Design a binder for this molecule. Sequence first.
Ligand SMILES: CN1CCN(C(=O)[C@H](CNC(=O)c2ccc(Cl)s2)NS(=O)(=O)c2cc(F)cc(N3CCCCC3=O)c2Cl)CC1
Ligand SMILES: *[C@@H]1O[C@H](CO)[C@@H](O)[C@H](O)[C@H]1NC(C)=O
Ligand code: NA
Ligand code: NA
Lengths: 27, 10, 250
Amino acid sequence: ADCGLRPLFEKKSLEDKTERELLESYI
Amino acid sequence: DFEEIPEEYL
Amino acid sequence: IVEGSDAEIGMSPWQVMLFRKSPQELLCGASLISDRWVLTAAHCLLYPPWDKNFTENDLLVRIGKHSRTRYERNIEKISMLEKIYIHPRYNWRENLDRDIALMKLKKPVAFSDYIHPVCLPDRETAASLLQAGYKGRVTGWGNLKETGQPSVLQVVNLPIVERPVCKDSTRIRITDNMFCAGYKPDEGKRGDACEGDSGGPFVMKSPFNNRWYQMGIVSWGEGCDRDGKYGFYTHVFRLKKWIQKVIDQF
Ligand SMILES: CN1CCN(C(=O)[C@H](CNC(=O)c2ccc(Cl)s2)NS(=O)(=O)c2cc(F)cc(N3CCCCC3=O)c2Cl)CC1
Ligand SMILES: *[C@@H]1O[C@H](CO)[C@@H](O)[C@H](O)[C@H]1NC(C)=O
Ligand code: NA
Ligand code: NA
């Protein structure tokens, strides 16, 4: 139920340095 | 090259 | 990982290191999918051309790691294997078709800031995300070049490549159980998995529910980061019926 949500990122609403590159590729 | 791991795991 | 960068702390908390007991060494990458199940490539456990055929007792799994060689006291968890399950139709003789294996841990691993499972895709997530041009993320402690070794976990973002381009890059027969990823020589960006990254995860962050899904398993490549070549990954969703069957039983 809690899979793929990172404690240090998604759980704190913090983004890692390159996840935006992935999102921008999803057209 | 690898640092030794606790014996309990071996 | 070739042409990647250092992972941030807790960036890939599903990252698993497959570790040989004697001699003490990195064997492969892997991923945490629940508190007692680890996903890897079948060739990390069984590869007769190299006389590779591990039993449960030969291996350890190291979870929550960042440094490659150091024992990360109070951060990493070292787990023993109860049972290894290899896809019965894994093709080691030709092209590593169905390059997948599951490893059940003897005891459940406790989740922490550094240890957390990745999701597995359902049909809809795979249809939505597995498209040419869409980027995924590959992580591992493998070689930094085809011909040293990193101090910490490496990360690289790579685009999924069109099936004809994957097929046209190699003489090997490519199956529906595989996909390829990486930049074309004309794209001016580089990056790939390498020796020691095999078995590791290829992940994507769903823009629909903001969760990370493991779409691929690092499988093989003709060398590492070679111009005109691509990395080949086991298509996780295509083998979900087997994954589910194994976890439902045992
Ligand atoms: C057993 N294990 C050996 C290491 N291995 C390899 O693919 C190696 C090193 N490169 C990589 O691992 C990868 C590169 C990109 C990705 Cl994704 S993984 N590349 S290789 O060219 O030296 C190589 C070594 C080997 F033993 C077997 C192969 N294969 C794999 C299946 C297709 C036919 C073949 O020759 C290949 Cl391509 C994965 C398989
Ligand atoms: C691998 O080893 C097991 C025993 O641990 C044996 O039963 C099996 O036949 C071996 N497979 C190959 C292909 O060597
Ligand atoms: Na869909
Ligand atoms: Na390439």
